[PDB]
UniProtKB/Swiss-Prot annotation, chain A:
Cross-link named Glycyl lysine isopeptide (Lys-Gly) (interchain with G-Cter in ubiquitin), sites: K69
GO MF entries: endopeptidase activator activity
Phylogenetic classification of the source organism: Eukaryota, Fungi, Dikarya, Ascomycota, Saccharomycotina
Keywords recorded for this protein, A-Z: Cytoplasm, Isopeptide bond, Nucleus, Phosphoprotein, Proteasome, Ubl conjugation
Chief location category: cytoplasm
Name the record gives this protein: Proteasome subunit beta type-3
Keyword Plastid: no
Swiss-Prot record, chain F:
More details: Present with 16800 molecules/cell in log phase SD medium.
GO cellular component terms given for this protein: mitochondrion; nuclear outer membrane-endoplasmic reticulum membrane network; nucleus; proteasome complex; proteasome core complex, alpha-subunit complex; proteasome storage granule
Gene Ontology process terms (BP): proteasomal ubiquitin-independent protein catabolic process; proteasome-mediated ubiquitin-dependent protein catabolic process
Name by which UniProt lists this protein: Proteasome subunit alpha type-4
One matching Pfam family: Proteasome
Entry keyword set: Cytoplasm, Nucleus, Phosphoprotein, Proteasome
PROSITE patterns in UniProt: PROTEASOME_ALPHA_1, PROTEASOME_ALPHA_2
SMART domains to which the protein is assigned, alphabetical: Proteasome_A_N (SM00948)
Positions of transmembrane segments: none
Quaternary structure note: The 26S proteasome consists of a 20S proteasome core and two 19S regulatory subunits. The 20S proteasome core is composed of 28 subunits that are arranged in four stacked rings, resulting in a barrel-shaped structure. The two end rings are each formed by seven alpha subunits, and the two central rings are each formed by seven beta subunits. The catalytic chamber with the active sites is on the inside of the barrel. Interacts with CIC1.
Compartments where located: Cytoplasm; Nucleus
InterPro entries, per database record: Ntn_hydrolases_N, Proteasome_alpha, Proteasome_alpha-type, Proteasome_asu_N, Proteasome_bsu_CS, Proteasome_sua/b
Chief location: cytoplasm
Curated annotation (Swiss-Prot), chain H:
Function: The proteasome degrades poly-ubiquitinated proteins in the cytoplasm and in the nucleus. It is essential for the regulated turnover of proteins and for the removal of misfolded proteins. The proteasome is a multicatalytic proteinase complex that is characterized by its ability to cleave peptides with Arg, Phe, Tyr, Leu, and Glu adjacent to the leaving group at neutral or slightly basic pH. It has an ATP-dependent proteolytic activity.
Residue ranges of coiled coil: none
GO terms for biological process, alphabetical: proteasomal ubiquitin-independent protein catabolic process; proteasome core complex assembly; proteasome-mediated ubiquitin-dependent protein catabolic process
Family membership noted in the UniProt record: Belongs to the peptidase T1A family.
Claim: Cytoplasm is one of the keywords in the record: yes
Entry's localization field: Cytoplasm; Nucleus
Source superkingdom: Eukaryota
Organism name: Saccharomyces cerevisiae (strain ATCC 204508 / S288c)
Protein's name in the database: Proteasome subunit alpha type-3
Glycyl lysine isopeptide (Lys-Gly) (interchain with G-Cter in ubiquitin) crosslink location in chain: K99, K198, K230
Note in the entry: Present with 17100 molecules/cell in log phase SD medium.
UniProtKB/Swiss-Prot annotation, chain I:
Function per UniProt: Non-catalytic component of the proteasome which degrades poly-ubiquitinated proteins in the cytoplasm and in the nucleus. It is essential for the regulated turnover of proteins and for the removal of misfolded proteins. The proteasome is a multicatalytic proteinase complex that is characterized by its ability to cleave peptides with Arg, Phe, Tyr, Leu, and Glu adjacent to the leaving group at neutral or slightly basic pH. It has an ATP-dependent proteolytic activity.
Single biological process term from Gene Ontology: proteasome-mediated ubiquitin-dependent protein catabolic process
PANTHER family to which the protein is assigned, alphabetical: METALLOPROTEASE TLDD, PROTEASOME SUBUNIT BETA TYPE-1
Organism: Saccharomyces cerevisiae (strain ATCC 204508 / S288c) (Baker's yeast)
PROSITE patterns per the UniProt record, alphabetical: PROTEASOME_BETA_1, PROTEASOME_BETA_2
Protein name listed in UniProt: Proteasome subunit beta type-6
InterPro entries, A to Z: Ntn_hydrolases_N, Proteasome_bsu_CS, Proteasome_sua/b, Proteasome_suB-type
Complex formation: The 26S proteasome consists of a 20S proteasome core and two 19S regulatory subunits. The 20S proteasome core is composed of 28 subunits that are arranged in four stacked rings, resulting in a barrel-shaped structure. The two end rings are each formed by seven alpha subunits, and the two central rings are each formed by seven beta subunits. The catalytic chamber with the active sites is on the inside of the barrel.
Lineage: superkingdom: Eukaryota
Localization per Swiss-Prot or TrEMBL: Cytoplasm; Nucleus
Length: 204, 231, 235, 195, 211, 240, 233, 244, 222
């Protein structure tokens, strides 16, 4: 009934030293029934990464929508969109559906190509921007993620250390949620290289 | 000349040529006569045929139980205007339980025709109408012109050669107005009036069309052998 | 330029008068009404011998009790026929009865003057609407693009109309049989047609109370043509 | 309607769909084909609310057939599935949404690969090795999770499908009157007339 | 209760005649068969007005088709005009259960079940209405493809009678139609009050009732 | 909206815009249609003023409306796409509602109806296109060939040509086509269609396109070499 | 759809030999609060019609304006506005009846019960009712709200059927109406002592009486009533 | 009324020509020449900027070559403002197709769509047509490398090599002379520049008077790269081919 | 909440004879337990020898009758003063009713007259337009009290011929206008006794080839 918890899933993002990390589980279900263990929730448009939790049809729809908009942005502007600008675009796009919203919990992550400054941001289903320094959480196990991140996180972590922190934050939070898990992916992002790692986790 | 391309253009002398050309279509139409007394109102119309195989074009249209008209000019325009009257007569009945006054019926026709003379794209109506009726203030006869001008009269005639019938009625004014409680004599006067507009042809059984409305007489049309009595 | 709904100084609508000229260029169509039925006949007028003449549909069914023949810009007639068929069927739906031929004709003629700046110009086609109803019996109407319709005992429209109408003037009487009318349409068509009349370049049809509207077979018309030739050679 | 299954093997996609059409307390038909051929190498099975299912399927069919004629070209299964998803995703926020769940089984002639897509009425698309809609998956996914291997032969796929239908016939309360099975491969679409 | 089934000699259509408003019997003389044309029949179940209105409307659409196309409309096309129409009104509260039955050269004898939910089904046998289950019992146990027009007509008559007896919202009388290659043929109105005692005596059935 | 009456009558009872649309058809490349006993062939001229053309991707002159019906044309190329699109949509709509593909006559009647509508609608000009519509009705082995024109009139033809120098090829077809015995085979029908185009075309190289339509959705377009063999055989018999 | 706020109670009326009588108190209630004590709910139209309105007062004021506008509109291009083509009671009623039923059909009614009382051109008595549902009926006696339950019974004792109308004089009819108004004051919790009464006679025309009061009331017997059963003091 | 002032943009001449289309084509014949050449391993787009100035900022300037998506590009000849209206529409159409089918739009489908829009302005609406002719250079996995052209009439055709704008008659003759089917991109680059160098109305062909682009599978493995040449890169290729 | 519907009570009855037809109805109009009018005509002459009554919610009933009378007027205008046959009127009323299928005229409509062969005809409608020609039909409040009586006394249901004991039915002999009026009066007298919404007066409209005649009878006023 509650659209935000039919399919289930989670996303978490963190900042480190000259790097950002964004991660998500791979589960897609119909309430109790697990349907797919390859439903990725992180997408990217150039060097800007977007994670989306919530109702899966809207996750897919928005991805297609932001691909549409960022492709036109690039043709006209003759440059790739930046995280700060994309964040405003996501907010604008969501609020235009104020009284008929997409049931999602987006999370933007990336590094500004000009300033080199790491950037993360979260939103509610209708566009409110949460621009945190430390971390952003989203999904059915957001409470769990808040508790993991708030205790595990420390500022200025190196890429390979940040990987361990965000991976353990996601994994242990998902294991306390019935509608999350079934695999996980972690993106480690630096100014001009991105590494994608699939995590080994319990499949129940 | 340069000012007759559309209805939205006055001429340098203040004339509306498209309206005047619409008025010309009436003069080409077949003659029809209207006249009334204090009790009854009568329409007499000379119907026109295409040839000997064809029927004679109907000239008279019923609008309500107490009102109707005769036409001269573009028949389809008379159908549009008579349909409008039918609706207005009907609106008055359904909403106010009130038979539409003949004078008010004329005012509505005037205003409908007027809109077509002041706007771009449209055209004036190409027909003249003679409306007869019996309402709360007795018998009535109206003459409608597509310029918008509507005129209440004792008697009149419109169409080709209508001047002959109109002069006759102008002489007979004092006589036919007094024909009260005698429908057949009032029709006779109308048949005699329309006869002053005939040349070459005469009134035959499928040529003549008569209508009447009065105190205790609903608007009824007489055609065929029903008018042989008056030939 | 000038308005589409403009009156001429004589009090006629330019466009309506010009559409009448297009109808004069059309192929001949003849209708004859009798007490045994109404006959409708048309000149097909194929532009080339390779054109399959049976595909030329200038006579058309509106309902079981109403038929229609056309002359002029025949493409314009299609929407008029569609309206006529819809009006005929719709009335049956609303009133559980056949529609009067005059009322059908009136409904078609209401479209005529719905042009301005609605459609952009009048229809360039005249129709002969023939049918039967219980009230007024067998009827033939001539529907023009002016919105005017006259009832006729007999009528010819198209390129050979005034010559055919003069011939119908002499030949028609109130006691004609259906067979006599059929031959009469064939006779007058043969007179005004450029090419020699046969079953392939001319088409007959009739409407009777019993059998309704029927388009004649080429075999049936061919016999009536042969019957015509013999009776003309008989004196 | 009720049960629709799909399984993608080595060189083909197999769709199984129940034959029953129950309208209340009566089984009206026991030979209903709950599928439409969208293109020569693409088949879509469907299940949901009465009327909406067929109306939607035939609407999709018409659109794909229109595309085929216009371009003289067959769309890939992936392209067709994306078109279908968008229609359902559009539909879910309509005045009256299409209440239809579908499986799209196609053979991509360009890549020489079978492809199975599961899409629900919300417009939720997933590519799968095997899929189901409604209560079917609750019984069948455990068997498939167990006996399925990606290099299976069409005959092995049919045997595994029989195992699924047998389990459904044993444990499901509703009598779905067996299934119509259809295979989609490089040579096109064909129906297994004995199952 | 209304049924229709395909067989060797074409189609049999049989319906009851009762109409109710709650427990109140509004009419026992209802015409639940619609003669769309000389080859098409329409059965009516559910809302009286909805069925009547839209099936006579269907006949107007079928007539317009054969005027435009100079050819008899197919049973498939006729049924789909009705199903597409009611589908536009889906949710508004129409209540219809109908069988569109007919014969054409290209199709042969054909029956389509059309429904206010938008359901359109082709099939050999259909029973629709509150007493459909009672009619199905008799039909399924006695149906064959090789039935004589006489025997098929009786089976349809008997299957309605079965439902008229048990179903409280069915009864009145039985209307029979037989659809062939040359069109449909009406086979009379049969009052259940007389038919029941006749069948009971001749057939030896209905031994639970006393007469 | 733009409501201007562009197609209107003139004093002599002519609609000049419709007649000028025919002049656009007269300018268009020649198209020919010939129906045999069990087939219809559509021949089309390709003007050789345009070389360096990519014949793979260039819009072909003959277009499939459905799997069993085809449409060729003469006149404005851009205008033809609009009619073809509408026709293709109507073909799928007919299948969807009637559960049966369109008859060749029905599809023609639709396309002709669209063309007519553009001759008495405000703000639009007529289509500068005449079409040849050919195919076989569903479950029918009788060949069908229809023609349409800007005015909206349509009719069936045993054989017909449209476009530039169509007067000449119609002259040829009128003396060479026998109704009592039409081209009995595919070969004879294609040969007669190529012969008719050779009266007008110039070179028999890439200037002639041929498309053969047979019953039961059997439509194929002949290649350059296949057509070139007909061109070779025709002239070798002519040298006598 | 709304709910009535400021309301008017019973409107009572009856026919007599030469015309009709209509009456209605001058109160505008706001629920149980008797908020407005000077409200005129009888609205004359010309010199031959009186429209009595109960129910929502804001809607009454709207209807009052429609009628005022109706008179204005009827005078336009009408030389016989004060003669043969003057507004009749039957015209005014049918107009209101049309409006009432149209408004109910849009699910936005005028929350009223109206009685149009008047005399026609030919001297015939006119008395007809219409309400928020567009329901119409005529009778020798008509009353709204509580008047339907208490006034009609009393007025029907005077004119029980059509044949009793010529036998009923204006003095007898007015007496019955005034008595009915007293009874309603005794028994309607939303009535006032002050009321207006209108007579439309075919001979003497329209007589409109304002500031009438209920008088000759019986209360003395109240002194003898003690307790609710057993109490003696 | 207003009829008096109506030019009637969508009518036939007595000869059966569309006045406004013919006059729009006359307008385009004065525009800077644009050339497209298709090779087996890529496509070349070359175009001449019209009588420029020394004070024009060339590196940020774009009047001829535009990007529709990553696979398709266009060369413009005519009114630049008109072209940008259509270009933005085309860009949107490609994105709509990508969103619907999750595949890049086939070149012809995009070309047909724009050509249909142009057609509409010649048949209805009473508006003037777009005074623009395009050369479409694109790639998809069905037909591979494709060259098309569209003009104000809305008619489009496919080409191996083609020119639009000024001196197309002279340009098309020169292309027809030196073009061969087994030609490669580097050879096509040379042919394009040589053709412009001979057909130009200017005294000499220089880097500041040119826009240049290539669509190559010369991208690392099975994929396509668009290259809009920079002013310095156009200057280098002019020296390489031996024109300056 | 606003309830756009109401119940004005009443009861109507149509009986088709061999060459005549009657349409009767009581003259009482009510709401809840109050009488609005003891004489409020419910059955109307609509012209063309057709009589009509729309029983139930009077506002919808008056609206429908008014609209049908209007349809008769326009039928004359549009079709050359042709007489509207009873079968054609019935079909026209179906379309009037079904035109408001999703906001119905809350009425049970009955019309009576003569068919085109001169025989008596009665047509019955439900609120949403379903209709059927009948020999006998009561409508409204006390329809359930009257119809069984009419099944018995007009169609001779459950009646057999003495001596045969259930074997031979009572033959369906035709009824005269005087016989029908007796059955109508007894039907309304009986309905008045046991139904509180029925009483005051009975008005009957009789239709023959000669035209439409009226008869009025008193009913109990309690
Ligand atoms: Mg689990
Ligand atoms: Mg029972
Ligand atoms: Mg009582």
């Amino acid at each position: 009934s509650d659209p935000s918890s039919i399919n289930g899933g989670i996303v978490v993002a963190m900042t480190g030293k000259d790097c950002v990390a964004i991660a998500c589980d791979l589960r897609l279900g119909s309430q109790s029934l697990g349907v797919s263990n390859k439903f990725e929730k992180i997408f990217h448009y150039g060097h800007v990464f977007l994670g989306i939790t919530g109702l899966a049809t809207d996750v897919t729809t928005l991805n297609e929508m932001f691909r549409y908009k960022t492709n036109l942005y690039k043709l006209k502007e003759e440059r790739a969109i930046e995280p700060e600008t994309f964040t405003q675009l996501v907010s604008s796009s969501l609020y235009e559906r104020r009284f008929g919203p997409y049931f999602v919990g987006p999370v933007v992550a990336g590094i500004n190509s000009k300033s080199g400054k790491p950037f993360i941001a979260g939103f509610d289903l209708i566009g409110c921007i949460d621009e945190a320094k430390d971390f952003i959480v989203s999904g059915t196990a957001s409470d769990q993620l808040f508790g993991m991140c708030e205790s595990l996180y420390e500022p200025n972590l190196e890429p390979e250390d940040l990987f361990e922190t965000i991976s353990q934050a996601l994994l242990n939070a998902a294991d306390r949620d019935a509608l999350s898990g079934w695999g996980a992916v972690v993106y480690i992002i630096k100014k001009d290289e991105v590494v994608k790692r699939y995590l080994k986790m319990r499949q129940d | 000349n340069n000012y007759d391309g559309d209805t939205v253009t006055f001429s340098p002398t203040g004339r509306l040529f498209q309206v005047e050309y619409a008025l010309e279509a009436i003069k080409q139409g077949s003659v029809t006569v209207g006249l009334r007394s204090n009790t009854h109102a009568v329409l007499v119309a000379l119907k026109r045929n295409a040839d000997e195989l064809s029927s004679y074009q109907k000239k008279i249209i019923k609008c309500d139980e107490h009102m109707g008209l005769s036409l001269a000019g573009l028949a389809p325009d008379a159908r549009v205007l008579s349909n409008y009257l039918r609706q207005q007569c009907n609106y008055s009945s359904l909403v106010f339980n009130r038979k539409l006054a003949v004078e008010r019926a004329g005012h509505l026709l005037c205003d409908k025709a007027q809109k077509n003379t002041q706007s771009y794209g449209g055209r004036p109506y190409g027909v003249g109408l003679l409306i007869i009726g019996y309402d709360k203030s007795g018998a009535h006869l109206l003459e409608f012109q597509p310029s918008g001008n509507v005129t209440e009269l004792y008697g009149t005639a419109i169409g080709a050669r209508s001047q002959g019938a109109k002069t006759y009625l102008e002489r007979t004014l004092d006589t036919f107005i007094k024909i009260d409680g005698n429908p057949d004599e009032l029709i006779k006067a109308g048949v005699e009036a329309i006869s002053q507009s005939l040349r070459d042809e005469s009134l035959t059984v499928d040529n003549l069309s008569i209508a009447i409305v009065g105190k205790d007489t609903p608007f009824t049309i007489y055609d065929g052998e029903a008018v042989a009595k008056y030939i | 330029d000038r308005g589409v709904s403009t009156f001429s100084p004589e009090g006629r609508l330019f466009q309506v008068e010009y559409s009448l000229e297009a109808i004069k260029l059309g192929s001949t169509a003849i209708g004859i009404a009798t007490k045994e039925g109404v006959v409708l006949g048309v000149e097909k007028r194929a532009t080339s011998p390779l054109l399959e003449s049976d595909s030329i549909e200038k006579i058309v069914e509106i309902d079981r009790h109403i038929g229609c023949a056309m002359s002029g810009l025949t493409a314009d007639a299609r929407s008029m026929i569609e309206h006529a068929r819809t009006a005929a069927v719709t009335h049956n739906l609303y009133y559980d009865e056949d529609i009067n031929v005059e009322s059908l004709t009136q409904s078609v003629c209401d479209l005529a003057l719905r042009f301005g700046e609605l459609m952009s110009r009048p229809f360039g086609v005249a129709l002969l609407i023939a049918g039967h109803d219980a009230d007024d019996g067998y009827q033939l109407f001539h529907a023009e693009p002016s919105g005017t319709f006259y009832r006729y005992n007999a009528k010819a429209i198209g390129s050979g109309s005034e010559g055919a109408q003069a011939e119908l003037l002499n030949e028609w009487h109130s006691s004609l049989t259906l067979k006599e009318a059929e031959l009469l349409v064939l006779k007058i068509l043969k007179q005004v047609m450029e090419e020699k009349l046969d079953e392939n370049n001319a088409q007959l049809s009739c409407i009777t109370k019993q059998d309704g509207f029927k388009i004649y077979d080429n075999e049936k018309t061919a016999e009536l043509i042969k019957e015509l030739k013999e009776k003309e050679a008989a004196e | 309607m009720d049960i629709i299954l799909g399984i993608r093997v080595q060189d083909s996609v197999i769709l199984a769909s129940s034959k029953a059409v129950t309208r209340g307390i009566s089984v009206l038909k026991d030979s209903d084909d709950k599928t439409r051929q969208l293109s020569p190498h693409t088949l879509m099975s469907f299940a949901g609310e009465a009327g909406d299912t067929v109306q939607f399927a035939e609407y999709i069919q018409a659109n794909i057939q229109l595309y085929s004629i216009r371009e003289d070209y067959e769309l890939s299964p992936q392209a067709v599935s994306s078109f279908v998803r968008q229609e359902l995703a559009k539909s879910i926020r309509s005045r009256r949404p299409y209440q239809v769940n579908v499986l799209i089984g196609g053979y991509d002639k360009k890549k020489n690969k079978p492809e199975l897509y599961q899409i629900d009425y919300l417009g939720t698309k997933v590519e799968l090795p095997y899929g189901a809609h409604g209560y079917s998956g609750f019984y069948t996914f455990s068997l498939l999770d167990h006996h399925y291997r990606p290099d299976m032969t069409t005959e092995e796929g049919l045997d595994l499908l029989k195992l699924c239908v047998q389990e459904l016939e044993k444990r499901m309360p509703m009598d779905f009157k067996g299934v119509i099975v259809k295979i989609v491969d490089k040579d096109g679409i064909r129906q297994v007339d004995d199952f | 209760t209304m049924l229709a089934f395909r067989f060797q000699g074409g189609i049999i259509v049989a319906v009851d005649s009762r109409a109710t408003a709650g427990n109140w019997v509004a009419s026992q003389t209802v015409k639940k068969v619609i003669e769309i044309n000389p080859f098409l029949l329409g059965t009516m179940a559910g809302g009286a007005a909805d069925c009547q209105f839209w099936e006579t409307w269907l006949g107007s659409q079928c007539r317009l088709h054969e005027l435009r196309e100079k050819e008899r409309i197919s049973v498939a096309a006729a049924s789909k005009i009705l199903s597409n129409l009611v589908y536009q009104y889906k949710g508004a509260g129409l209540s219809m259960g109908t069988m569109i039955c007919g014969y054409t050269r290209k199709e042969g004898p054909t029956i389509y079940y059309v429904d206010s939910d938008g359901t359109r089904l082709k099939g050999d046998i259909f029973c629709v209405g509150s007493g459909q289950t009672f009619a199905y019992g008799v039909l399924d146990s006695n149906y064959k493809w090789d039935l004589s027009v006489e025997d098929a007509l009786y089976l349809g008559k008997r299957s309605i009678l079965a439902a008229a007896h048990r179903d409280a919202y069915s009864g009145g009388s039985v209307n029979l139609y037989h659809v062939t290659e040359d069109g449909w043929i009406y086979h009379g109105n049969h009052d259940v009050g007389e038919l029941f005692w006749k069948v009971k005596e001749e057939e030896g059935s209905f031994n639970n009732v006393i007469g | 909206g733009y409501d201007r009456a562009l197609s209107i009558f003139s004093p002599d009872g002519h609609i000049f815009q419709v007649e000028y649309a025919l002049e656009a058809v007269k300018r268009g490349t020649c198209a020919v249609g010939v129906k045999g006993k069990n087939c219809v062939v559509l021949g089309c001229e390709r003007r050789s003023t345009l070389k360096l053309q990519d014949t793979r991707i260039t819009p072909s002159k003959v277009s499939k409306i459905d799997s069993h019906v085809v449409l060729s044309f003469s006149g404005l190329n851009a205008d033809s796409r609009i009619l073809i699109e509408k026709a293709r949509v109507e073909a799928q709509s007919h299948r969807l509602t009637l559960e049966d593909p369109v008859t060749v006559e029905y599809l023609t009647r639709y396309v002709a109806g669209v063309q007519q509508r553009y001759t008495q609608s405000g703000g639009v000009r007529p289509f500068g296109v005449s079409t040849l519509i050919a195919g076989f009705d569903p479950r029918d082995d009788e060949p069908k060939l229809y023609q349409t024109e800007p005015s909206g009139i349509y009719s069936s033809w045993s054989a017909q040509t449209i476009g530039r120098n169509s007067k000449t090829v119609r002259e040829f077809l009128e003396k060479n086509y026998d109704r009592k015995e039409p081209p009995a085979t595919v070969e004879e029908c294609v040969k007669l269609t190529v012969r008719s185009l050779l009266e007008v075309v110039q070179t028999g190289a890439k200037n002639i396109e041929i498309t053969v339509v047979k019953p039961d959705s059997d439509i194929v377009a002949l290649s350059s070499e296949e057509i070139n063999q007909y061109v070779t055989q025709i002239e070798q018999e002519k040298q006598e | 759809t709304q709910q009535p706020i400021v309301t008017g109670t019973s409107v009572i009326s009856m026919k007599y030999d030469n015309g009709v009588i209509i009456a209605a108190d001058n109160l505008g209630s706001y629920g149980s609060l008797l908020r407005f004590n000077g409200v005129e709910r009888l609205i004359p139209v010309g010199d031959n019609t009186v429209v009595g309105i109960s129910g929502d007062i804001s809607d009454m004021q709207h209807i009052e304006r429609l009628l005022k506008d109706l008179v204005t509109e009827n005078a336009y291009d009408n030389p016989l506005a004060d003669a043969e083509e003057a507004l009749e009671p039957s015209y005014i009623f049918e107009y209101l009846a049309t409006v009432m039923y149209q408004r109910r059909s849009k699910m936005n009614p005028l929350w009223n019960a109206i009685i149009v009382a008047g005399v026609q051109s030919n001297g015939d008595q006119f008395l007809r009712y219409v309400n928020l549902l567009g329901v119409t009926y005529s009778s020798p006696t008509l009353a709204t709200g509580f008047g339907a339950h208490m006034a009609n019974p009393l007025l029907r004792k005077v004119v029980d059927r059509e044949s009793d109308i010529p036998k009923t004089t204006v003095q007898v009819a007015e007496e019955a109406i005034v008595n009915a108004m007293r009874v309603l004051y005794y028994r309607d919790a939303r009535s006032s002592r002050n009321f207006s009464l209108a007579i439309i006679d075919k001979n003497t025309g329209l007589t409109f009486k304002k500031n009438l009061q209920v008088e000759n009331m019986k209360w003395d017997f109240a002194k003898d009533i003690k307790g609710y059963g057993t109490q003696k003091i | 009324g207003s009829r008096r002032y109506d030019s009637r943009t969508t009518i036939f001449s007595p000869e059966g020509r569309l006045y406004q289309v013919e006059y729009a084509l006359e307008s385009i014949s004065h525009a800077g020449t644009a050339i497209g050449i298709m090779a087996s391993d890529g496509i070349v787009l070359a175009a001449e900027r019209k009588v420029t100035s020394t004070l024009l900022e060339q590196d940020t300037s774009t009047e001829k070559l535009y990007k529709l998506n990553d696979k398709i590009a266009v060369a413009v000849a005519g009114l630049t403002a008109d072209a940008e209206i259509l270009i933005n529409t085309a860009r949107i159409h490609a994105q709509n197709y990508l969103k619907t089918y999750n595949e890049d739009i086939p070149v012809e489908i995009l070309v047909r769509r724009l050509s249909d829009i142009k057609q509409g302005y010649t048949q209805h609406g009473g508006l003037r047509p777009f005074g623009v002719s395009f050369i479409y250079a694109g790639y998809d996995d069905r037909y591979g490398y494709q060259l098309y052209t569209s003009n104000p009439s809305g008619n489009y055709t496919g080409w191996k090599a083609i020119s639009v704008g000024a001196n197309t008659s002279a340009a098309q003759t020169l292309l027809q002379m030196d073009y061969k089917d087994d030609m490669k991109v580097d050879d096509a680059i040379e042919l394009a520049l040589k053709t412009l160098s001979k057909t130009t109305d200017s005294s000499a062909l220089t880097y500041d008077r040119l826009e240049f682009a290539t669509i190559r599978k010369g991208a690392n493995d099975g994929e396509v790269y668009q290259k809009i040449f920079k002013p310095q890169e156009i200057k280098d290729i002019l020296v390489k081919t031996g024109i300056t | 909440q606003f309830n756009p519907y109401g119940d004005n009570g009443g009861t109507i009855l149509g009986i088709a004879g061999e060459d005549f037809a009657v349409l009767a109805g009581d003259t009482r109009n009510i709401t809840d337990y109050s009488i609005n009018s003891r004489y409020e005509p419910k059955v109307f002459d609509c012209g063309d020898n057709i009589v009509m009554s729309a029983n139930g919610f009077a506002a919808d009933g008056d609206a429908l009758v008014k609209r049908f009378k209007n349809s008769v007027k326009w039928y004359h205008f549009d079709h050359n003063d042709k007489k509207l046959s009873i079968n054609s009127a019935a079909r026209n009323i179906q379309h009037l009713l079904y035109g408001k299928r999703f906001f119905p005229y809350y009425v049970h409509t009955i019309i009576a007259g003569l068919d085109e062969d001169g025989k008596g005809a009665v047509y019955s409608f439900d609120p949403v337009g379903s209709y059927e020609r009948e020999q006998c039909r009561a409508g409204g409040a006390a329809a359930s009290l009257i119809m069984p009586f009419l099944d018995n006394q007009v169609n001779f249901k459950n009646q057999y011929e003495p001596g045969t004991n259930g074997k031979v039915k009572k033959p369906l002999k035709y009824l005269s206008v005087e016989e029908v009026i007796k059955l109508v009066r007894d039907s309304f007298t009986s309905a008045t006794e046991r139904h509180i919404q029925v009483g005051d007066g009975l008005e009957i409209l009789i239709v023959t080839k000669d035209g439409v005649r009226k008869e009025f009878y008193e009913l109990k006023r309690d």
